[model samples]
Target chain A: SAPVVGIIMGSQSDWETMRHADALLTELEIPHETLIVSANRTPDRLADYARTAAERGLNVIIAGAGGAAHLPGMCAAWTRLPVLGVPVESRALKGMDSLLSIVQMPGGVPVGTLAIGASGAKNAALLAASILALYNPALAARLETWRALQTASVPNSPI
Target chain B: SAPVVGIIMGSQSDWETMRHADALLTELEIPHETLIVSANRTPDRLADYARTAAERGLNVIIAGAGGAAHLPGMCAAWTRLPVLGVPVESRALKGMDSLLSIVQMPGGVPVGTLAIGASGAKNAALLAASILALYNPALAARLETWRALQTASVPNSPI
Candidate 1:
């Protein structure tokens, strides 16, 4: 199936965190594509990718980055599709910079921001899945089941 | 009301957002001191301020900063008192940068983090008030009334 979700990251370093999104999407059998795209270093590439994302048949875009983290916002800048941001932990700041960079979008453009680090990446995928589930009935059922299992697994009180 | 809460920000620019915290604290009738103390520019000043905060009769510290916000964490490093962080909005990234810089504190040392910009500032003040209210019964009643009024004022559905 042609990819419906496009997962883009700043670089290879992001894969450590973004892999969670990839794994979760794969777990749910969501047709998606993952690749590296830097907003700062590869401006034209990002521009072209985001500009053509909708035309390329992508429904949702999940972007993750660290430090100055601009990939997610820049991607949203060019694409009309919903963009979910994951702030990968940076060496110095631990993804706080990345979180702020992606989450604090201006009035016109918006990025559905998640938490910092791996939890954020996972939530981004889950959020993208939720969006897709809006139109995809099959996915909606699967997502509901997944959520139920997660809720069931939680202990009532911590040990 | 003697100063029990210390509201510290990076510089004058942050006063706009930090002022929300100041105003909220005032509304709650929680005495606090708001001052400009940059972690990077005036390291010694912040060091002295944090180190002596408890002795100065300060119970809680509300720290707000933008960009590379190290004030709250650094302040936490010096003092054992609870430090609530407010991420002031920055020029380039709104308050995302500020949010991450303050919220993503490493393990062991904790900065009870709030949202970015004005709302965050306001919440930080309320949180500080709640902390003070834990011991001071008068403020606790005021805070409960304030919160109940806020809840009462909320519309069930948006127009």
Candidate 2:
């Protein structure tokens, strides 16, 4: 199947965090692809990938980066697809810098930013599914099932 | 003069962030105190600090911590005095852990969490003043002046 979501990270190091996004996509049976394309290190590739994303049939893009994270915003700059940003938790300032840089986007461009780290990555996938399900009935049904299962999985009270 | 606001940090390293809290307090002329208390590293200290806060004449407490930050929640657990949590951008999860751990408190316990990093830290200080000013006429006047200064500092349009 052609990819619906493209998950890109600034470095392979982000795989640990980006994997959570992949896991959620797998659970939803959503076709997705991952790439290590740095905005700063490989500006041309970043621009090329983003410019060609829509032509390549990608419906959504998930970009996770840390530190001076700029991939998600830059991608959103080029594409009209709804971009979900996951601030991969950093080492020095944590993902705070990542969160601000991503969340504080200029007018006309909006990036739905998630929390930092693993949970944020996981949420990004769920959010993407939610957006896609808006147009996909089968995926919507699956999502409803997933939600029900999640609710059922929780105990009535703490164990 | 007795302190009305209590500024506590998880580690001395957090001084950089917490210092903004102190600076704001100084500007407002709100009597305050600072302490180095860690929730994970010094559970006993946290417990003691939280338990004794209200009795010590504090109207508000500002607790800042980084990764897996729990100081603010722990403090909120101990005192009825409103606690403001600042997620000190961490090294690992970039304060996302701090943010979630603090914001996702159980019902009945609340920690008004601020933004992650310095702006969050500064807002925490201002929020503290806003909370206390409800009953403090003098402090309220100071806050109004501070707010005016902040608004004035912002240019009408981007430079």
Candidate 3:
């Protein structure tokens, strides 16, 4: 599929978390693509993807990885395109390890980091669309409706 | 000081978060040392520190870092001692990046990661003492008392 957002993860294992981003992007009808691009194992692919991201019609990139996860930060360092990071839950420490690695970008380069696990993945899509919504009023309307629906769905009491 | 624990951070900037771990260790009378050991900026120092950690009479280590944080993982990789990782709050991604990097280690290595920012630092010290408490009943009693006091500190209602 032609994509404005590129969703990449460290491994096939991350599908459990990254899929949440993919699902939300679908719900919002945001055109995006997915790939397994490990930063350590495959540095060349990561470098290529980040360098070509802006010119390839991608407005935003959401990279998810766990455990010394360098995927998101590596991408942000290479390109100016706004990248959002998702911390996939790791085996020993849950997602805390993942969350910090992706969210702690230095100045100049930036990766707008989301929460840990699935929630972070979902928000990455919303945030990506929100960025695009600046020039895309139609997307802005959908995002507002989606947020409103989310607000309406909240229960009055803790169930 | 003859330290039982080592609390190392990536930079002096991390002193803000690592201090929380220091204070907790101090309160428990668990002698610990603190140093700035950057993995990228000072790889050689990081290697020497991790390699000699256990031999130097340190039973546990708490490492805090941000932005592609490899300090905790690298430390754990070099030594068999139990290691705790704290995701120091970062400038751009707000420490989400810091958390993942520390928590997610490949199966051969393990880094017990705590939450983001101050809370994680506090917990890392507690967890470290908890590890030591297994062999030292007196320390165990102190940790138990501390836990009970902490439990009592929480409010019944959100104020």
Candidate 4:
């Protein structure tokens, strides 16, 4: 089957943050693809890609960007597909700028924001999987197994 | 009037974050004081200070720290006074480490966390004011006026 998740980042520079998304998707064994689509530098491409994404079999779009991140919101503006926004850690304000820009959208347009940096990216993947699992029972079972493993991995008390 | 709010930081380096706390308290006309108490470096000091804070006219404590922040939690451990935590932006993780450490305390110890960096620091002060307003009528009136002013400052649309 074709990929169900589209992980788009603002630039090659954002790979450090986007990699967490890639890692989590791989760990969950979900079919996903990654691409660089800058909102400022390549607005036309982003609009075109987002407009046609639903028909292309993309179930969820994970958009990550640093410093005034507009990709996720812009993409959501173009498509009805649920867009998960990842605020990549940035240089000046330490991604707080990215985080606020992504999370604090107007009432109508909603972007599910994650924690900042790698953890946020990782959680974005998990959230995506959880969403996808609604239809795929096997994947849902895998998610249950993953949760059990997570519980088992933690120590009874802090070391 | 005796100071009711205690603004504490993990290190002298956190003066930048705690300054916002100071400013907010001043604006609210809430009598307050600031202190430098490190959790990792001065665990004994933190314990002693938090233990005796209630007797020293302190109603609430605002603890700001960066990088594996445990100051706010430690203070909460020592005192029953409500504690508000500000995760200062750090050099490495830009405060995500600080946020997780402050926000994810054990169920018993609750630390109300604010956003990271300057705004987080500002919000921490506001949170402290909000907590104090529960007891002080004059302060509560001032806070209401402040909120009204803030709302009035916002325009219908971005410039």
In the range B1-159, model 3's lDDT, one tens digit per residue, is 699999999999899888999999999999889899988899999999999998999999999998888899998988889989998878787777887788778898999999778878998999999999999999999999997765444322111
Residue B19 CA error for candidate 4 (Å)?
A: 28
| Model 2 chain B weakest lDDT span, ten residues long | B37-46
Model 3, which residues run further than 4 Å from truth?
Answer: B1-159
Question: Which of candidates 1 and 4 is the stronger one according to lDDT?
Answer: 1
- Model 3 reproduces a share of the real contacts of 0.00
* lDDT score at residue A70, model 1, on the 0-100 scale: 94
TM-score of 3: 0.52
Using all chains and alpha carbons, the TM-scores for the candidates as numbered come to 0.52, 0.54, 0.52, 0.56
Residue A127 in candidate 2, Cα distance off native in Å = 0.8
Regions of candidate 2 where Cα sits further than 4 Å from its true position: A157-159, B1-159
lDDT of 2 at A140: 98
lDDT of 1 by residue, A128-156 (tens): 99999998999999999988776444332
Docking quality category of candidate 3 according to DockQ thresholds: incorrect
Best of the candidates, TM-score: 4
lDDT of each: 0.88, 0.89, 0.87, 0.87
The candidate scoring highest on DockQ is 2
Second chain TM-score per prediction? Answer: 0.95, 0.95, 0.96, 0.95
